[PDB]
Amino acid sequence: STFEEMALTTFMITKESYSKLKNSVSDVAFNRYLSLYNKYRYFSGKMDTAAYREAACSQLAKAMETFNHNNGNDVLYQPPTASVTTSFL
Amino acid sequence: STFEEMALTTFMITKESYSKLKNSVSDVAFNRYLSLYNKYRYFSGKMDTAAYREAACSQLAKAMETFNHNNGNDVLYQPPTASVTTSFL
């Protein structure tokens, strides 16, 4: 989907950007994402690739409410840091 | 792009998914990947997100060649098992 897809890319949250994003997600999900963010906010270490994706959406949510209560500033959105460890594929 | 998007998912390679995938990628690209299989098959450790993506592609290119060379018997493609250590912003 566009939202989760976007939460996995670096970009600027702007007027256009944010508008695009509010309209690609349901507020029930958006507010759900905004809640979990607290779950991860201060967590560092390994997690399954599926948990990373859910986590990134959370950060996108937070990054969005920040821009919205900025008065249309512009905020940089970078996916949460990822050091992936694979072994001989 | 189709090739990479799928290198990120688990699916059964069939005559139909081989082909869709092959048509999408140039021989140069496919072979490069196939060739990078020889790098990642032995990689064991931390890599960033783009590297993991190229890693998953080399793994799919390889699975396709395994498909092609076993007379088209189904071969399950599966992205390289991974754990991402994270921190947010």
Numbering used by the authors:
A (entry chain B), B (entry chain A): 0 to 88
Could you pull the original sentences from the published paper?
Here, we report the crystal structure of the C-terminal hydrophilic domain of nsp4 (nsp4C) from MHV strain A59, together with the structure of a C425S site-directed mutant.
Mutagenesis of Cys425 to Ser broke the disulfide bond, but two mutant monomers interact with each other via their cross-linked C-termini to form a strikingly different “close” conformation compared to the “open” conformation of the wild-type dimer, in which the C-termini of the wild-type monomers are oppositely oriented. Thus, the mutant C425S monomer structure contains four α-helices (α1–α4) and four β-strands (β1–β4). The conformation of the four α-helices and β-strands β1–β2 are identical to WT, while a short β-strand (β3, S449–M452) between α3 and α4 and a long β-strand β4 (β4, T487-S493) at the C-terminal are formed for stability of the dimer during the crystal packing. Ser425 from each monomer in the mutant dimer is oriented on the outside of the dimer, far away from intersecting C-termini of the dimer. In the case of the C425S mutant, the disulfide bond is dissociated and the dimer adopts a more stable conformation by crystal packing: the flexible C-termini of two monomers are stabilized by hydrogen bond interactions between the amino acids in the Ala488-Thr492 (β4) and Ser450-Met452 (β3) loops, which form stable anti-parallel β-sheets at the bottom of the dimer, resulting in clear electron density from residues Ser489-Leu495. The intersecting C-termini of the monomers result in a “closed” conformation of the mutant dimer. Thus the conformation of mutant C425S dimer is not likely to be physiological but instead an artifact of crystallization.
